[PDB]
Amino acid sequence: EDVEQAFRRTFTSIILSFQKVIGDGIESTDDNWLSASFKKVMVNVKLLRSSVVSKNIETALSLLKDFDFTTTESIYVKSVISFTLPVITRYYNAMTVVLERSRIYYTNTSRGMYILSTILHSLAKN
Amino acid sequence: NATLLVSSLNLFFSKSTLGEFNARLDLVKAFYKHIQLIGLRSSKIAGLLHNTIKFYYQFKPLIDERITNGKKSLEKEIDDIILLASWKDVNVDALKQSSRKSHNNLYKIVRKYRDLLNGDAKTIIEAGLLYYEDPNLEASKNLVKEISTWSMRAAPLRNIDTVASNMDSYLEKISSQEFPNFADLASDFYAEAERLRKETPNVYRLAYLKTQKSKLLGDALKELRRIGLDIQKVQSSTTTILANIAPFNNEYLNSSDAFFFKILDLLPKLRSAAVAAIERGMALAQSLMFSLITVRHPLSEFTNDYCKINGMMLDLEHFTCLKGDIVHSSLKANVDNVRLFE
Numbered sequence: 001e002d003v004e005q006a007f008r009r010t011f012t013s014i015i016l017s018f019q020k021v022i023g024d025g026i027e028s029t030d031d032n033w034l035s036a037s038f039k040k041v042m043v044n045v046k047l048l049r050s051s052v053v054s055k056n057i058e059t060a061l062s063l064l065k066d067f068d069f070t071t072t073e074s075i076y077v078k079s080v081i082s083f084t085l086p087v088i089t090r091y092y093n094a095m096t097v098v099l100e101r102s103r104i105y106y107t108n109t110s111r112g113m114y115i116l117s118t119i120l121h122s123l124a125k126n
Numbered sequence: 127n128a129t130l131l132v133s134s135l136n137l138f139f140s141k142s143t144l145g146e147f148n149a150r151l152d153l154v155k156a157f158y159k160h161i162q163l164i165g166l167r168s169s170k171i172a173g174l175l176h177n178t179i180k181f182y183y184q185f186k187p188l189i190d191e192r193i194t195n196g197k198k199s200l201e202k203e204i205d206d207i208i209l210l211a212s213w214k215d216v217n218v219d220a221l222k223q224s225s226r227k228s229h230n231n232l233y234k235i236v237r238k239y240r241d242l243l244n245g246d247a248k249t250i251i252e253a254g255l256l257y258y259e260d261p262n263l264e265a266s267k268n269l270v271k272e273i274s275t276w277s278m279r280a281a282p283l284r285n286i287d288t289v290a291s292n293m294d295s296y297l298e299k300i301s302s303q304e305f306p307n308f309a310d311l312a313s314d315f316y317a318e319a320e321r322l323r324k325e326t327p328n329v330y331r332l333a334y335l336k337t338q339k340s341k342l343l344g345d346a347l348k349e350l351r352r353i354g355l356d357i358q359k360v361q362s363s364t365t366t367i368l369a370n371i372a373p374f375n376n377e378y379l380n381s382s383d384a385f386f387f388k389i390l391d392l393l394p395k396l397r398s399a400a401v402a403a404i405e406r407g408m409a410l411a412q413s414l415m416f417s418l419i420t421v422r423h424p425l426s427e428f429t430n431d432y433c434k435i436n437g438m439m440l441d442l443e444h445f446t447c448l449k450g451d452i453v454h455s456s457l458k459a460n461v462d463n464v465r466l467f468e
Contacts, residue, residue, distance in 0.1 A: 004280045018293055021300060029306040035354025037305040038417050045424055050431040061438060068452035075451060076279060081442065082271040083278075083286060090293040092439055093263050095432055097301045100261055102425065103382050105305060110385040110418060112312035113411065117392055118257065119319055120407055123343065124399035126323075
């Protein structure tokens with residue numbers, strides 16, 4: 001019952017972020033897009049505010065082991081926690097499409113930078 | 127605290143030898159796993175040692191290559207003296223002289239080892255170097271969950287049916303998001319540049335090959351300026367940047383960052399190497415280097431959250447498997463009792 005407020009306080013924090021994602025547009029190569037995408041990914045990671053999400057959700061967890069409740073606000077809690085995980089399903093999956101897409105994004109640029117450094121080094125010797 | 131430390135450390139590896147090398151790394155990783163032990167309370171000084179080990183460990187297989195192609199002369203010689211020392215018609219009195227002579231022949235041959243072993247660890251650094259973890263989820267916390275969820279209780283602040291559809295539809299839209307790659311362009315330049323530098327007869331179309339040289343070196347910088355692009359005071363040397371870098375420690379990005387650490391070896395050679403396109407480009411990459419560097423601390427903290435929430439989604443998906451009710455604090459002690467007995 002107190003945990004109703006606890007798990008509502010994070011439930012408001014998380015959907016809001018998805019409303020912020022659609023708050024920003026979408027990018028699909030033609031002109032001035034690397035200098036756009038370095039910033040897009042950096043506002044996208046900032047949009048998630050995960051340092052507070054992982055904090056307040058871990059706090060909502062910590063009471064569950066540090067404190068217990070016998071058969072009262074512990075028996076419809078399954079009706080509560082069922083009410084709040086068709087969504088972390090979406091979120092943790094949403095944490096990854098950016099992350100797997102960002103990991104590769106770092107690597108293309110760093111490897112092209114390696115090749116360009118080798119090129120200009122060769123041309124330094126020309 | 128930091129710059130002095132990386133500089134004082136760089137001697138400890140640069141002042142060594144090829145057989146006096148791996149012991150240094152296996153001595154220093156002890157210190158790296160020691161600072162973790164005190165805690166991530168101290169997470170400014172272990173990040174250093176991580177990046178330095180990632181830097182010098184990059185060189186180790188090429189070091190071992192040298193001894194492996196170097197020992198082959200010596201293994202053969204010791205085999206030859208062994209089969210020389212192979213005895214037939216035993217003849218005790220002849221054996222002793224064959225022993226004390228052989229010790230003289232061994233003495234020079236180990237010396238050759240010491241000529242390989244005392245070789246400078248520096249020169250391999252001085253030559254530099256010439257040239258996915260697959261995460262996914264559609265996790266399976268399925269029912270338990272039903273219209274049973276509608277039991278509420280203490281709430282006055284909701285429908286869950288369509289919003290679950292709203293968020294996966296958002297996931298469809300954002301999963302379709304994608305940016306272009308970059309390595310294709312550097313590889314096109316790689317192709318045409320190796321063509322120009324390889325298509326030279328050097329015979330006195332020398333002027334025409336110079337025309338194409340000018341064309342490519344102009345076009346490259348133009349199209350580089352076409353898409354995107356004061357940092358001198360911080361980004362001028364390895365220790366200036368490496369003593370403040372954000373590392374990767376969690377094993378999602380310690381397979382996808384050596385293409386960064388490789389940039390560090392040739393970079394001093396670029397600085398020593400230094401028409402005006404040269405001045406544009408050498409300064410051009412520093413902004414790109416900064417764009418590649420600055421990202422690392424944000425994404426490190428992002429990942430540091432990510433593993434926790436995965437490990438806790440795991441817990442709560444196991445919390446769906448409740449059968450009784452909350453009894454863990456009373457259980458919190460005896461679990462440690464039995465685990466102590468494990």
